[PDB]
Nucleic acid binder design. Structure first.
Length: 87
RNA sequence: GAGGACCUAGAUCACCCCUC
């Protein structure tokens, strides 16, 4: 556990942790007490289309935050790998 | 808070910044 954790979340997947108007992101912050900061649009890790997600706070809060987010991204991937994409 | 900027083939953009 550290006070600042970073994850790289594919761009087409980042909106899942942001949510409508950012209401999900805000939710995870209220629930964990940690601050989640996502890179600005168009800003990705070099040589990729992954947005940088920066989590900060107490070690316990940054770890819960990092876990719920990754869990959230992993949940999404599954649903997207099982179900048909609406268009 | 609300406009805006910044990116958008689809798969959510808060925070920061600007204006009030």
């Amino acid at each position: 556990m550290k006070e600042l954790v970073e994850i790289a979340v594919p761009e087409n997947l980042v909106g899942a942790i942001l949510g409508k108007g950012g209401k999900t992101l805000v939710e995870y912050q209220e629930l964990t007490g940690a601050r989640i900061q996502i890179s600005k649009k168009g800003e990705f890790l070099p040589g990729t289309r992954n947005r940088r997600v920066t989590i900060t706070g107490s070690p316990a809060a940054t770890q819960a935050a990092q876990y719920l987010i990754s869990q959230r991204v992993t949940y999404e991937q599954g649903v997207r790998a099982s179900n048909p994409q609406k268009v």
